[PDB]
């Protein structure tokens, strides 16, 4: 959306967003130190957030916490006959998610490419135009240091497999963040090295205890989470160094990361996304998918597989449309030197 000069950057000369209030920078420095000490005083928890602890907290949250027993009879629009069969799943006052519209000032229109490059030719096959979508302004950088923020509601992201959260700071500014499995409307978060080891809290890798479940880990200092963002994904702390932190990713891969980078504590929301079963091809049609035609039912010129008839068999290895093997054939530059990768 934005210009290349406005979006492209290699080197970063800052890792925080400063919003001073005093007339002079000398006073602002003292104010920042006071805020940091205030957050340090409040911080109390330092134990690692393990899977077992996560489980135990989830059991408490989803066993007894939710009890209101409300009078839903009065919570409805009186005198509205409604549709002739069409009814919502649940009322807005009992739904998990917010029954509304995304913020106008935190969203924009989505440019649909249809899987086409500048040349105008089809690049990405099987790409349809489904339901209209809006790009969300997700705040990946926690620039707001030494400040608390409470959660107002949880939103749905069509573009992501996880849920979002509407964060509001004390000053009254609204921002979007990646929600968690634990976080519920009303919970408070803070981004600071002196903060406690709690869900939602963002702390450096180095400060984060060992054997701690984390997510939204950034590659470079102050760049944003790229290695793990999807729902149900998380990383683990293995080892620690004076300048490096060893992390186990979701793909069972061991890699070292800088000690200076930031990371979030917890698990991405919507853990049960891989349990839905589509009852008909209409779901795929609405999602923006297209039918896939196998190469077997193609002409020899169209596809190598064409013409040649045969079942599983063992003589002639299969060939893709591109003339390249697709079974156990590694696709990686052997010359590319391994970096911070420990175990691949």
């Amino acid at each position: 959306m934005l210009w290349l000069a406005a979006t492209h950057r290699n080197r970063v000369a800052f890792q925080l967003f400063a919003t001073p209030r005093e007339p002079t920078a000398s006073k602002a420095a003292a104010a920042a130190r006071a805020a940091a000490e205030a957050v340090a005083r409040s911080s109390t928890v330092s134990a690692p957030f393990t899977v077992q602890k996560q489980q135990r907290l989830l059991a408490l949250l989803a066993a007894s916490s939710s009890v209101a027993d409300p009078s839903a009879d009065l919570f409805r629009v009186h005198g509205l006959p409604g549709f002739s069969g069409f009814r919502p799943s649940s009322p807005p006052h009992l739904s998990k998610l917010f029954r509304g519209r995304v913020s106008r000032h935190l969203s924009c229109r989505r440019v649909n490419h249809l899987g086409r490059n500048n040349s105008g030719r089809i690049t990405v096959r099987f790409r349809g135009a489904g339901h209209f979508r809006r790009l969300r302004f997700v705040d990946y950088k926690r620039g707001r240091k030494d400040i608390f923020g409470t959660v107002l509601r949880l939103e749905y992201d069509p573009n992501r497999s996880a849920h979002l959260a509407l964060l509001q700071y004390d000053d009254g500014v609204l921002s979007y963040i990646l929600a968690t499995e634990v976080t519920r409307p009303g919970d408070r978060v803070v981004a600071s090295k002196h903060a406690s080891i709690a869900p939602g809290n963002c702390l450096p890798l180095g400060n984060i205890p060992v054997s701690t479940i984390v997510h939204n880990v950034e590659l470079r200092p102050g760049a944003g989470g790229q290695i793990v963002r999807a729902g149900g994904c998380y990383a683990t702390v293995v080892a620690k160094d004076r300048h490096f932190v060893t992390l186990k990713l979701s793909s069972t891969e061991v890699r070292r990361f800088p000690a200076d980078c930031w990371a979030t504590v917890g698990q991405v929301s919507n853990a049960a996304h891989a349990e839905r079963i589509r009852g008909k091809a209409g779901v795929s049609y609405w999602m923006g998918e297209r039918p896939r035609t196998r190469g077997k039912a193609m002409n020899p010129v169209d596809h190598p597989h064409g013409g040649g008839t045969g079942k599983k068999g063992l003589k002639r290895p299969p060939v893709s449309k591109w003339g390249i093997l697709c079974k156990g054939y590694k696709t990686r530059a052997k010359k590319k030197p391994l970096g911070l990768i420990v175990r691949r």
């Binding site: 009065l74 919570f75 409805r76 629009v77 009186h78 005198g79 509205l80 807005p92 006052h93 917010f98 029954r99 509304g100 519209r101 106008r104």
Partner: protein, 267 residues
């Protein structure tokens, strides 16, 4: 500078002509219409009109959080004029002094006296919260809904609301030379009150002049508010001048009288 540029009256697009199908779009465009703005937005929009209320809402904590919930609600916003002309001078001055005290406390924060201040703020906040929350009513109640509820649409109950006439010889002598020479509906109790709210309807003064300028087909028989409309809705003996302020959270109605609970009412 294209194939077609006609607009407005000359709309190139073709629309349905069937009255049956047309009768269904009006329902969707009026009743099932969606609103983005919240109740607070609506309230704020008329800050000028209700400054007292606008300030109390943002001054006393708790009310702001309560009036932002997803559940349907119904709100009444009394007017400054109504407040002024209803409330006695001493009560009005005392209320304004406490609102200013809370605003000053917040300004001091953002910028045995210490012990007494805590008790004073604790008592004043509860009193104002109680006062404020009294107006709030669960559920969505529309003007039409109330009107119909009050028996406005029942032919057996519309006898005193349909046939209205006045002396035409006194107001239009030139056009007449031959002559020369309801029920109570009970609403759910408020959030901070157990007592129900009675609502009724009344005939306006203007309604008694329609026949002089309209075609009437009546059968054979055998102070006054200046607000417009044929019918006047009285919600607990407060007249409604404006209503149908639909929002994402409910509806807002402006009444010409401040509703005060018995707990605050004197002996």
């Amino acid at each position: 500078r294209w194939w077609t540029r006609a607009s407005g009256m000359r709309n190139p697009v073709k629309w349905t002509r069937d009255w049956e199908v047309l009768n269904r779009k009006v329902y969707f465009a009026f009743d099932e219409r969606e609103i983005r703005r919240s109740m607070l937005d609506a309230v704020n929009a008329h800050r000028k009109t209700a400054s007292l209320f606008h300030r109390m809402i943002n001054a006393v904590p708790g009310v702001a959080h309560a009036m932002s919930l997803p559940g349907p609600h119904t709100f009444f916003l009394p007017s400054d004029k109504a407040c002024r002309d209803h409330l006695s001078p001493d009560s009005l001055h005392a209320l304004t002094e406490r609102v200013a005290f809370l605003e000053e406390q917040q300004r001091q924060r953002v910028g045995g006296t210490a012990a007494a201040i805590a008790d004073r703020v604790a008592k004043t906040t509860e009193q104002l919260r109680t006062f404020v929350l009294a107006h709030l009513i669960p559920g969505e109640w529309r003007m039409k809904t109330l009107l119909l509820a009050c028996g406005a649409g029942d032919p057996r109950r519309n006898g005193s609301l349909r046939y209205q006439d006045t002396d035409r010889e006194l107001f239009a002598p030139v056009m007449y030379a031959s002559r020369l020479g309801s029920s109570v509906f009970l609403l759910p109790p408020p959030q901070s009150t157990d007592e129900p709210l009675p609502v009724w309807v009344q005939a306006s003064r203007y309604a008694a002049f329609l026949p002089i300028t309209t075609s009437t087909n009546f059968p054979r028989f055998e102070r006054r508010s200046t607000v417009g409309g044929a019918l006047h809705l009285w919600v607990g003996g407060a007249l409604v001048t404006k209503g149908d302020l639909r929002a994402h959270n409910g509806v807002v109605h402006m009444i010409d009288k401040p509703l005060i609970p018995v707990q605050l009412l004197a002996s």
